[model samples]
Target: MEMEKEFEQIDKSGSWAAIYQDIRHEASDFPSRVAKLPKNKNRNRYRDVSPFDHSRIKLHQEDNDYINASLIKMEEAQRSYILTQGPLPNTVGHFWEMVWEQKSRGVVMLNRVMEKGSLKCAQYWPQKEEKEMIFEDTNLKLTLISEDIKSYYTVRQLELENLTTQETREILHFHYTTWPDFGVPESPASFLNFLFKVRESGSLSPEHGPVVVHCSAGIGRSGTFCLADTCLLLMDKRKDPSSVDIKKVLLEMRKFRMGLIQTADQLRFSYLAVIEGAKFIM
Candidate 1:
C-alpha cells in the first residue's frame, strides 16, 4: 500500500508528463562536442542522439577511438551499464571491440535488427550457418556457440576472441525481439523475466566490466531497462521501497546518455515495471 500510494502521488502530479518535463529541464547540459566531430559523423546512427563527451566510451585504438556509446554508472545501486546505439555496418567491429576492451560479459539487446520494414541495426553476430564473424579493423572474432530461442527473446552464447593474442571470452547476448520502437514491452512480468534471466548469468555483477545495453537509439528502451533495473536494485537494498523516486533515478541516468526514455509512455512503463518487479524483492 505504501508503494501504491507513492505511485498514486506521482500520478496526481499529472502522471508521466510532468515527471518527464521535470527530468528534461534538470538534465545535464554537458558538452557532446566529440560526437559532432567531422571524423566521427558516420559512426552515429542517429544525428540527434549523441553520447556526452564526459561519459562516452572511448576505444583503446589510437586516432580512431569514437563509438556512440555512453558508460552510465549508478553508484548507489553499484551498477555500471554501457548504453549505446545499434551498430552501424562499419561500427559493428568497433562494437565487439568495446565489449572486449571493457571486459563486459553480457550484451543486452532490446530491439530487433529490423522493425516495421526498416533496418534498425546491422546483424553484428553470426547466424547458425555462418557460425563466425570476424572484425579485422578491431582484430576480434565473434563465434556463435549456442542459442536458446524463446517466444519473445533469444539468448545466445558467443565467444569473443582477441585475434592478436588468440585469447577468448564467452559473452552472453540477451536479445529481446518483441519490444517495438517507441513502445513498451507487452508486460512488466515478461520484461522482468528476461531481466532476471540476465541477472541469473551473473554478468551484471561488479566483477564484470559493464553490461552493454542497446536498442535502436539506445535511449528509449535502453533507458527504461536501466532505470527499472537500477530502481529495483535500490529497492532491494533500502529499508523502505516506497522511498525510491523513479523520476530522480531516470534524470541521473540521462546525464551519462542523452534523451533516455524518449516518450512519456516509456517513462510510465518504467514505473510499472519497477513496481511489479519489486514484489520479488519485498
Candidate 2:
C-alpha cells in the first residue's frame, strides 16, 4: 500500500531522528518558563524537573506548590494523562495528593525499584498488611490489597485513603519491570499488549481521572506511550492510518511537557509501535 511506501521513506530518510533533534532544539525555550516558576523549582526533587507553563498541573491549595507534572489531554482519544517524574523520597506525599486531587484511578509505572544500583523511583506503595504507608504531610494512606505478577508487568490493587475525610478509593498500579532506563523495548507487540491491558481496565477512560504515567523523568517511554496511543486513536477514528502524522502528534504532545521522547531511538520505536498498531486496527 501507499502507506507502506511512506513508512519506508521515513525509515530510510531518518526523518524521525530529525524530528527528535528539532524538538530538542525547540525545547530550549521552555527552560526560561520553568525558571520563572521559583516555587515549583523548590519542591522538585531534581533541578531539571520542570513543567511546561501552558500545560502544567496547578494545585488547588495555596501552601503546596509541587508542580513537576503536566496534564496531557488527548481529546481525539478521549483520554487524559498526567505525565510526571518518578516519585522522589520527599515528593511521595505530593504525588499522592496530586492523585487524590485529580481523582485518578490508576498509576502507570515504567521503571523498576532500582536501575543499575540507582534509585530510579521511591517505593511509594505498601507491600505488607502491617506496613501501610501513611503520608504525614498529605494525610493520605496507601495499602496494597492484592497483586498479580505477569511475565513482563505486575498489576497491583492499592487502596488509597483520605484520613481526614475517611474516604477510600481503589487505585490500579501497572508496573512494567523489564523496560531498561534509556533503552526501547524489544518489540511493538509486547508493548502494545501492555497498552491494551491498560485500555481494557477502563482506567484510561474519560469516566475516570487522568491516569498518572511516569518513568524516570516521565519523558522518554511515557511520551512514546501517549504518542502511540493518541496516533492509534486518531487512525481508528478516521479509518486512515496514512493520514495520521506521528511527528505532528508528538510535537503537539510536547506542548504539555518538555523534553518528551528524549532519544532518537525512542522516536523510532514510537513509529514502529504506531505502524504495528495500525496494522491490527486496519
Candidate 3:
C-alpha cells in the first residue's frame, strides 16, 4: 500500500494516537541527561537548550567546555549528525573550533540569521567576498571562498584554517533559508530536494565527520530535519519501504535528543515527507 493510504488506515484504526502517546510518554520517562553534564550549565546559549549528557558532543581538546551539541549516530542507517543549537555571540569561536577539530565536511544550517522579526541565530559565517574572519578566542580563521545562492537555499564553500598548525580544511555550508520556525516545510519535494543536494556532496556519509545540523534550539526544526532525513534513508535501504515505521524511528531518535518533533503537525508532516521521499527512492 502507498504510505499516504497506510497513514489514513493507521489514523482510523486509533493505533496512531496510541503510538504517538506511547512515544511521548516514553520520551518523558528518559532522563534528558542535560543536568548530568555540569559544564553544559555554563555553555548553553539558552538555559533550556542544553544537550543530553549521554549523547552530548564534548570538546575533546578543551579542558571543561561544552557546546550545546550532540552526536546522533544511527548505525544501521549509516547516518551520523552533530545536532546543535545556533551559536551565541560568546560561543561563535567555540562553534568554529568544534567544526575544525571534528574535521566536519559540511554544516547544515536550517534557520536563518533572523526569523519572524526575531534573532534566531547568530551571523557566524563570513559574508560576501570577505578576506577572512578571525576568532580571537579559538584562534581560528574562516575564509569565504565562494557562494551559490538559489531560490530557497544558499551553498557556500568555506576554508577553515587552524592558527596553531596552519592546517586548512574546506567545508561546505548548506543553508536552507526558507524553512519557518516551529513549522514544517511548505512542500516535501522542496525539502527533500535540499537534502539530496547535501547527500550528493558525500558530506553526510560516514567516511567523513558528522555534518553539523542546527537551528534555534537544535531540537524543534533541527529534529524534524534529522528525523525526516533518517526515515527516508531507512526506507531507501529496505525491500519494503513501508515496513519502516515512522513513529518507531522517531522514538529511537529521541533516545539521543530530547523533544525532537516539537508539534503534532511536524510529526504528521514527517510521515508525508518520508512517503514522498520513498517514491523518489523507488
Candidate 4:
C-alpha cells in the first residue's frame, strides 16, 4: 500500500457528517453539536464543550459493551472500516498519550492538538522520565506487566510514573505485519501473505498491545488494522465480528484523536482488509 507503490490519493474533505448518519452511538448531545457546527472547521483545532477527557459514551444501539468513545466506538469502526488498511498506503498511523485512570483498569487517551494548516502527527510518542516526573497526572508508576517469548507472539511491559492523580501516562511501541516482507502489500500475493500473518497472531495475543498506530487524522488504516487484528483473533476463539460496527468504532477513536478516516475510500479499504483477513482465518 504505502511503502512500495505510489498510492492513488483518494480525494476527501471533512464536511459536517450527513444528517441522521450514524455519527456517534447514543449521540444525544453530539447531534446538536454537529447541527450547530460552524462551517470550515479543521480536525484538531476546535472549541467544543464536549468532555475531552474520557467520557462514558455508551453507544448501546451499537455495541453491547460500549464504554467510552476512545475505545468503544473506535473498536467498532475498526471492525467495519477497511478500504484504508488494504494495500493502499505504505503505512497507517495510530498512537495515544494515555492517562490510566483506573489503576490500569481504565485509560484516557491524549494527543497534542495540531495547528491548522501545519503538518503534525495525530499522536505523540511517549517520553521516558524519572519517577515523580509524570507522578503529577496520577500518583502511580507503570508497573511491570509481563514479558514472554514462549507464546507465538512476543510481549513486553513498561512502568509509568504518576504524582497526584489516580492515573498515569506511559508509552508503548508495536510493529507487526500480516506479511513477510513487513511492508505494505502490492498484489494478491502480498495481500494474501499480509492477511495470513495477521490471522496467525490470533492464537498468540488476544489483545495485541504493543506499538499502537496513529497516522494523520488517526482514523482509517490505523483503526482497521488494529480492530481487524483483534476481531480476527476473537474469531479464532469463535467470536462474532458482527458484535462490532465500524462506524461506531471510528467515532470512539475520535475521542482520542480527531479526523479519523473521514474519507469513504479509507473506510472501504478497511472493509477489504477485514474481508481478506476473515478468509485468511478460515
Candidate 5:
C-alpha cells in the first residue's frame, strides 16, 4: 500500500514538474574546478556539464588526468556506476584506459554515434567491418569479436588488449541504439527488458569494478538508466518499494555528479520505468 501510494502521488498531475523544479537546484553550488582548468577545457564535451572534482574519476596513466567521468555509488544497493560522456575523438584512448584501469566488466552506451545529423559521440569502438582499432597513445587494441543486433539495441562482444603487457579482457558493450536524444525509451517494458539483459550478464555485480554508463553528455539518459537501476535494487532490499523516495534518491545521485536527469520529461520517465519495474519485484 505504501509503495503504491507513493507511486500515485508522483503520478498525480504536475507533481513531477514541481518536484523537478525544486531538485534542479539541489547541488548547483558544487565546484568542478578540475574540469574547467585551461588545460582540460577542450576535454569537456559540454561547457556547463562537468563532473564534480570530489567524485570525478582521474586517469592513472595519462599525462593529463582529467576525464569527464564521475563514479556514482548507491551504497545500500551495492551499485557503483561510472557516468561519463561519449568519447571525444581525442579522448577515446583515455576512455578505454579508464575501463582497463578500473577493470569494468561492461559499458552501457545510451546514445548513437551520430544523432539527428549531429556528431553526438566519436566512433570510439571498433566498427563491424573495421574489426580492429589501435590506440598508439594508450597502447590499447580493440577487436570486435561478435555482434548481436536487435530492432532497437545491439550487444557487442569485444576484446581489449594491453599492447605492452599483452594481457587481454573481454568487454560487453550494451548499446541502446534507438533511445532518442533527450527523450525516454519507447516503452517502460522495452527499457526494462534492456536493463535486465545487462543484469543477466553478471556485469553489474559488485564483484566487478563499476559498470561504465554514458550518453551524449553523461547525465540525461545516462542518469535515467542509473536512477532506474538503482531504485529497483533499493526496492528489492526494502520490505516496501515505496519507501524508496525517488526524489531523495535522485538528489543523492546529484551529489556525486552534477546536472543528472536534465529535464522534467526524463525525470518523469524514470518514475514510469521504476513503477513499471516494481511489478516484477512484487
Candidate 6:
C-alpha cells in the first residue's frame, strides 16, 4: 500500500531521534538574524536583486556566515531520516493520530503556527498559563533546524499553539534552492557563509543534541544535507579532498540515511550538487 511505508526505518551506523515539523509560528521577521545576500553568480539570475531583497529564492543564501563541509563538520544522526511528499494529512488537534496512527514518533507541527510564508514563529508567553508554563520552558531551549524560510513561522506558531515544545526536539534544517540545478553556481565564500549558518543551528550529534530538518519530501536535499555533514565529520580531513572520495563518501552515506539520493534522477541531482559543492569548498 502507498501509505504502508510512509517513511520506514532502515539500518544505521548508530542511533538517532525520530521527529518532524511543528505547525506554524507567530511573527519574528522569519529570520530574526538577516545575512545579506551577495550580488554575485551564487544567486539565481535575477537583475532587480539588491542588498535588501525579499524574494525567497534570491534572499536565502548569504556569503558571510555560510561555509562548506571542508572547513565545518555537521552530523544528522537520526536513527532514521526520511523525506516525504505533499502537505501533512492531519492537524495538531489530531496530531497524535498522524504520529501514532501513521506510526510516526513525533512532529514539528508548523502549518498552524506561522504568520504567513515568512521566517518567523510565534512566541510562548509564560504568564498565560501556570501549569502549562512548565512544559513550555523545556521546549524553549529546542534548537531550530529548518531552512524553508517559510517553515520557521509555522514551526514556531505550532510550538505556541500546541502549548508545548518538542519533548526532545532537534532540528537539522535544510536550505536547498529549487532552480532545477542540484547545485546552484555559488561562490566559495558564499558556500562558506551557508556553512556558518549550518554550524550555528547545530545538528543530531550526541555531543550537541536532537535534530530536525526539511526539504520538499524530507528526502533528496535533506538526505544530502545530513549525509554530507555526517560523512565529512567522519572523514575529518583538512587537505584537498578528491571528487572520487566525495562520491565514495555519499555512497557510504546511504547506509545510515535511507535512499539519500534514492532514484536515478534524485541521485543525479545529488551527485551533481556534491560535485559542485566539493570543488568550490576545497
Candidate 2 Cα misplacement greater than 4 A, ranges: 1-4, 13-16, 26-42
What local lDDT score does residue 194 receive in model 1, on the 0 to 100 scale? 91
RMSD of 6: 19.4
TM-scores of the candidates are: 0.95, 0.92, 0.91, 0.40, 0.95, 0.37
How would you encode candidate 5's per-residue C-alpha lDDT over 1-282 as one tens digit per residue?
464566577777558777788998665557889999999988999998889989999999647898999999888888999999999999999999999999999999999899888999999988874769999989999999999999878999999999999999999999998886545765788788899999999889988999999999999999999999999999888876567888888999999998899888898888888888988776
lDDT of each: 0.89, 0.82, 0.81, 0.34, 0.89, 0.30
Estimate, for each residue in 146-185, the C-alpha lDDT of model 4 and write its tens digit: 4333212223344454434444443332222232212233
State the number of backbone clashes in model 1: 0
Worst 10-residue lDDT window, candidate 5: 1-10
Off by over 4 Å in 5: 1-7
- lDDT at position 16, candidate 4: 24
Q: Candidate 6, which segments miss by more than 4 Å at Cα?
A: 1-87, 91-192, 235-244, 262-282
- lDDT, candidate 4, equals 0.34
Error of 6 at 69 (Å): 24
Residue 55 in candidate 2 has what lDDT?
A: 78
In model 3, where is the ten-residue run with the lowest total lDDT? Answer: 28-37
Worst lDDT 10-window in candidate 1: 178-187
Model 1: per-residue Cα lDDT over 74-193, one tens digit each:
988999999999999999999999999999999999988989889989999999737688899999989999999998789999999999999999999999987855567667888999
Residue 44 miss distance in model 6 (angstroms): 33
